[PDB]
Scaffold this active site. Structure first.
Site, PDB file in Angstrom:
ATOM      1  N   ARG A 113       1.124 -93.281  35.360  1.00 48.45           N
ATOM      2  CA  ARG A 113       2.112 -92.814  36.326  1.00 48.45           C
ATOM      3  C   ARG A 113       1.544 -91.679  37.168  1.00 48.45           C
ATOM      4  O   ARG A 113       0.974 -90.723  36.647  1.00 48.45           O
ATOM      5  CB  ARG A 113       3.361 -92.318  35.588  1.00 48.45           C
ATOM      6  CG  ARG A 113       4.634 -93.069  35.896  1.00 48.45           C
ATOM      7  CD  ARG A 113       5.686 -92.811  34.823  1.00 48.45           C
ATOM      8  NE  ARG A 113       6.829 -93.718  34.929  1.00 48.45           N
ATOM      9  CZ  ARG A 113       6.813 -94.984  34.534  1.00 48.45           C
ATOM     10  NH1 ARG A 113       5.714 -95.495  34.008  1.00 48.45           N
ATOM     11  NH2 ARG A 113       7.881 -95.745  34.681  1.00 48.45           N
ATOM     12  N   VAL A 161       3.165 -96.759  39.783  1.00 49.41           N
ATOM     13  CA  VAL A 161       3.285 -97.109  38.377  1.00 49.41           C
ATOM     14  C   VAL A 161       2.463 -98.330  38.016  1.00 49.41           C
ATOM     15  O   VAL A 161       2.383 -99.274  38.793  1.00 49.41           O
ATOM     16  CB  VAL A 161       4.760 -97.416  38.038  1.00 49.41           C
ATOM     17  CG1 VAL A 161       4.846 -98.125  36.699  1.00 49.41           C
ATOM     18  CG2 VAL A 161       5.577 -96.139  38.050  1.00 49.41           C
ATOM     19  N   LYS A 189      -0.940 -96.591  43.871  1.00 49.41           N
ATOM     20  CA  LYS A 189       0.101 -97.400  43.253  1.00 49.41           C
ATOM     21  C   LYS A 189       0.775 -96.455  42.268  1.00 49.41           C
ATOM     22  O   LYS A 189       0.159 -96.014  41.302  1.00 49.41           O
ATOM     23  CB  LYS A 189      -0.496 -98.591  42.510  1.00 49.41           C
ATOM     24  CG  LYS A 189       0.541 -99.394  41.717  1.00 49.41           C
ATOM     25  CD  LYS A 189       0.195-100.892  41.599  1.00 49.41           C
ATOM     26  CE  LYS A 189       0.912-101.525  40.415  1.00 49.41           C
ATOM     27  NZ  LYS A 189       0.341-102.843  40.052  1.00 49.41           N
ATOM     28  N   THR A 193       0.807-100.708  34.371  1.00 51.22           N
ATOM     29  CA  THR A 193       0.574-100.890  32.944  1.00 51.22           C
ATOM     30  C   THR A 193      -0.653-101.723  32.569  1.00 51.22           C
ATOM     31  O   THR A 193      -0.985-102.710  33.224  1.00 51.22           O
ATOM     32  CB  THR A 193       1.800-101.548  32.299  1.00 51.22           C
ATOM     33  OG1 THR A 193       2.923-100.678  32.459  1.00 51.22           O
ATOM     34  CG2 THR A 193       1.556-101.834  30.805  1.00 51.22           C
ATOM     35  N   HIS A 252       2.898-112.121  37.200  1.00 47.38           N
ATOM     36  CA  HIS A 252       3.614-110.914  37.553  1.00 47.38           C
ATOM     37  C   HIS A 252       4.073-110.150  36.311  1.00 47.38           C
ATOM     38  O   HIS A 252       4.528-110.743  35.337  1.00 47.38           O
ATOM     39  CB  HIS A 252       4.808-111.284  38.446  1.00 47.38           C
ATOM     40  CG  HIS A 252       5.782-110.167  38.652  1.00 47.38           C
ATOM     41  ND1 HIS A 252       5.474-109.038  39.378  1.00 47.38           N
ATOM     42  CD2 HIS A 252       7.060-110.010  38.225  1.00 47.38           C
ATOM     43  CE1 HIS A 252       6.523-108.229  39.391  1.00 47.38           C
ATOM     44  NE2 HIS A 252       7.495-108.796  38.701  1.00 47.38           N
ATOM     45  N   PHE A 253       3.934-108.831  36.346  1.00 48.24           N
ATOM     46  CA  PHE A 253       4.351-107.998  35.232  1.00 48.24           C
ATOM     47  C   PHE A 253       5.722-107.449  35.582  1.00 48.24           C
ATOM     48  O   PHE A 253       5.882-106.760  36.583  1.00 48.24           O
ATOM     49  CB  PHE A 253       3.356-106.857  35.023  1.00 48.24           C
ATOM     50  CG  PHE A 253       3.554-106.119  33.743  1.00 48.24           C
ATOM     51  CD1 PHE A 253       4.341-104.981  33.706  1.00 48.24           C
ATOM     52  CD2 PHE A 253       2.964-106.565  32.567  1.00 48.24           C
ATOM     53  CE1 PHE A 253       4.543-104.292  32.517  1.00 48.24           C
ATOM     54  CE2 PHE A 253       3.161-105.880  31.367  1.00 48.24           C
ATOM     55  CZ  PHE A 253       3.956-104.739  31.343  1.00 48.24           C
ATOM     56  N   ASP A 254       6.708-107.753  34.748  1.00 51.30           N
ATOM     57  CA  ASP A 254       8.082-107.336  34.997  1.00 51.30           C
ATOM     58  C   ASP A 254       8.514-106.005  34.419  1.00 51.30           C
ATOM     59  O   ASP A 254       9.110-105.178  35.117  1.00 51.30           O
ATOM     60  CB  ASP A 254       9.044-108.406  34.489  1.00 51.30           C
ATOM     61  CG  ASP A 254      10.349-108.405  35.241  1.00 51.30           C
ATOM     62  OD1 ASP A 254      10.365-107.852  36.360  1.00 51.30           O
ATOM     63  OD2 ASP A 254      11.345-108.954  34.720  1.00 51.30           O
ATOM     64  N   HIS A 290      -5.257 -80.303   9.097  1.00 47.46           N
ATOM     65  CA  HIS A 290      -4.306 -81.060   9.901  1.00 47.46           C
ATOM     66  C   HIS A 290      -3.961 -80.585  11.308  1.00 47.46           C
ATOM     67  O   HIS A 290      -3.209 -81.257  12.016  1.00 47.46           O
ATOM     68  CB  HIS A 290      -3.008 -81.225   9.098  1.00 47.46           C
ATOM     69  CG  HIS A 290      -3.212 -81.811   7.738  1.00 47.46           C
ATOM     70  ND1 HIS A 290      -3.540 -83.133   7.540  1.00 47.46           N
ATOM     71  CD2 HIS A 290      -3.179 -81.245   6.510  1.00 47.46           C
ATOM     72  CE1 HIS A 290      -3.704 -83.357   6.248  1.00 47.46           C
ATOM     73  NE2 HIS A 290      -3.492 -82.228   5.601  1.00 47.46           N
ATOM     74  N   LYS A 314      -5.589 -73.873   4.683  1.00 49.02           N
ATOM     75  CA  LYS A 314      -6.199 -75.144   4.312  1.00 49.02           C
ATOM     76  C   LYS A 314      -5.506 -76.215   5.126  1.00 49.02           C
ATOM     77  O   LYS A 314      -6.126 -77.183   5.566  1.00 49.02           O
ATOM     78  CB  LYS A 314      -6.005 -75.429   2.821  1.00 49.02           C
ATOM     79  CG  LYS A 314      -6.797 -76.622   2.323  1.00 49.02           C
ATOM     80  CD  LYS A 314      -6.181 -77.207   1.077  1.00 49.02           C
ATOM     81  CE  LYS A 314      -7.022 -78.348   0.544  1.00 49.02           C
ATOM     82  NZ  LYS A 314      -7.422 -78.098  -0.865  1.00 49.02           N
TER      83      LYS A 314
END
Lengths: 124, 124
Positions: B85, B43, B41, B45, B119-121, B12, B7
């Site tokens: 990535r 890396v 590219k 986000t 800019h993304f740091d 689950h 079950k």
């Protein structure tokens, strides 16, 4: 000449809430795993880890269940899991679930020999 | 009479990684946002939040850019973002990315007036 700001949007913005991909996962899976019969099970979690690993949980850190009688176990490391929660407008027999993909530790109750999960307690 | 253990599995377990619908999200995104043109590219986000919301981070807490700049800002609240990535098999012109969904604080560099992310740091 693309502006540095605009470059940031092209490279980093996507407000179209990516995860949308599997937005109907709970809706579908909550139906196939016969958990919408008669009523809509309000909450439910799915562990996408190897059945072996989940089973190995039974031999991890022993802890109390959100009940009052000891028999639960928490994973050493977290596991990819999916959270299914009945939505607002949901109405049987037309259930409606929200799909949330997270990664937390899981707590299950084990039983039998050898020991195997027999109850899903919670996560975190 | 379904066994309690069984079950548990029906209710689950979904060992087949349920992140396939989204296991190729970065591949599509890295593609359309022109980040696989000429070279892959390595890396990148994606912030899965409203633009206006992000733009406000420009006026949230102040911080030191990873290098050493004095500007930059850190969101006070975490956000839904996706990590892309390049995989090990990835070789231009066949860029291949791994998708990782997480929630966390982001660190940006702002500029111009009014201040907007340019800019993304990093994140944490």
């Amino acid at each position: 000449k693309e502006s540095a700001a605009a470059k940031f949007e092209r490279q980093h913005m996507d407000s179209g809430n990516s995860a949308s991909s599997s937005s109907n996962y709970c809706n579908q899976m909550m139906c196939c795993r016969k958990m919408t019969q008669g009523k809509c099970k309000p909450v439910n979690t799915f562990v996408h880890e190897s059945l072996a690993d989940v089973k190995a949980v039974c031999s991890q850190k022993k802890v109390t269940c959100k009940d009052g009688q000891t028999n639960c176990y928490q994973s050493k490391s977290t596991m990819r899991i999916t959270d299914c929660r009945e939505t607002g407008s949901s109405k049987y027999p037309n259930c409606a679930y929200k799909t949330t993909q997270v990664e937390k530790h899981i707590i299950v109750a084990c039983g039998g020999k050898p020991s195997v999960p027999v109850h899903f307690d919670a996560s975190v």
